[PDB]
Amino acid sequence: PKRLYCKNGGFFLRIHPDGRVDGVREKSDPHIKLQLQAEERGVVSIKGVSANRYLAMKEDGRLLASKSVTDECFFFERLESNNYNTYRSRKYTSWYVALKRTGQYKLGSKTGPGQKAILFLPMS
Ligand SMILES: O=C(O)C1=C[C@H](O)[C@@H](OS(=O)(=O)O)[C@H](O[C@H]2[C@H](O)[C@@H](NS(=O)(=O)O)[C@@H](O[C@H]3[C@H](O)[C@@H](OS(=O)(=O)O)[C@H](O[C@H]4[C@H](O)[C@@H](NS(=O)(=O)O)[C@@H](O[C@H]5[C@H](O)[C@@H](OS(=O)(=O)O)[C@H](O[C@H]6[C@H](O)[C@@H](NS(=O)(=O)O)[C@@H](O)O[C@@H]6COS(=O)(=O)O)O[C@H]5C(=O)O)O[C@@H]4COS(=O)(=O)O)O[C@H]3C(=O)O)O[C@@H]2COS(=O)(=O)O)O1
């Protein structure tokens, strides 16, 4: 398990028990602890431990969490330079998981491979 800390603003990814996704700064938040499970090399589903919900990306780029697994709940995890990680949707293949600088998430339909918003340094 671990926390994903976004390089764009220093916000940790957070999955609430209601299915709401956002980024926090409080590093002791219980909702940022996540669990990543591999569906084989490169693919992973991300799960918010407490909430018990999986991060899912919708077709309009919005980000949210679902009690159950769906094709919108798997991401290609790629290790970048300096150890930052990026999560791209296995279904909306050119869309990444990302947070803006204000802390709120950023529509996957406005992301890209060289954005600071998609970078996450994982912290146990
Ligand atoms: O609505 C839109 O669609 C939209 C799109 C348009 O872009 C724009 O529309 S327009 O009409 O105005 O044209 C507008 O953009 C807004 C963004 O959508 C919004 N994005 S967000 O995700 O919601 O937050 C927001 O963007 C801010 C974000 O931080 C970020 O956006 S993102 O998409 O990339 O994620 C972006 O960050 C900039 C950063 O501010 C720049 N810094 S600088 O001071 O201007 O130079 C720049 O950072 C670069 C440095 O240039 C680079 O310097 S160097 O010369 O290359 O060395 C430095 O590099 C680091 C390197 O990262 C380190 N690597 S590490 O160790 O592995 O970590 C290390 O090597 O050290 C290097 C040196 O760092 S040092 O300075 O400390 O010495 O840092 C990088 C860096 O990324 O940090 O560029 C980034 C991103 O690249 S780019 O997009 O500029 O090309 O932009 C932020 C921002 O500009 O505020 O706000 C946008 C503005 O909208 S608004 O304010 O007008 O409303 O909307």
Q: Residue 45, SS3? A: strand
- Ligand 1 centroid to residue 116 C-alpha, Å: 6
DSSP string, 45-112: EEEETTTTEEEEE-TTS-EEEESS--TTS-EEEEE-GGG-EEEEESSSTT-B--B-TTSSB--GGG--
Resolution (A): 2.2
CA 44 to mean position of chain CA atoms:
11
| Residue keyed to tokens 């949210």 | 64
Distance CA 5, CA 102 (A): 14
Q: What is the CATH number of the domain that holds 55?
A: 2.80.10.50
Mutate to test the pocket of ligand 1, among 100, 116, 119, 120 (most ligand atoms within 8 A of CB): 116
Instruction: Give the residue, by CA position, lying nearest to ligand 1 atom 94.
Output: 101
Give the number of domains in the chain.
1
For the record, the structure tokens of 123 come out as: 């912290």
Q: Which structural domain, as residue segments, surrounds residue 38? A: 1-124
Would you state the structure tokens that stand for residue 32, as one six-digit string? 């940022």
Residue 94 Cα to ligand 1 middle (Å): 20
Asked if residue 85 belongs to a known ligand binding site, the reply is no
> Nearest-CA neighbor of 120 among 70, 46, 69?
46
CA pair distance 14, 47, nearest whole angstrom: 10
PDB experimental method: X-ray
Distance from the CA of 66 to the center of ligand 1, in angstroms? Answer: 31
Distance (Å, rounded) from C-alpha 99 to C-alpha 103?
6
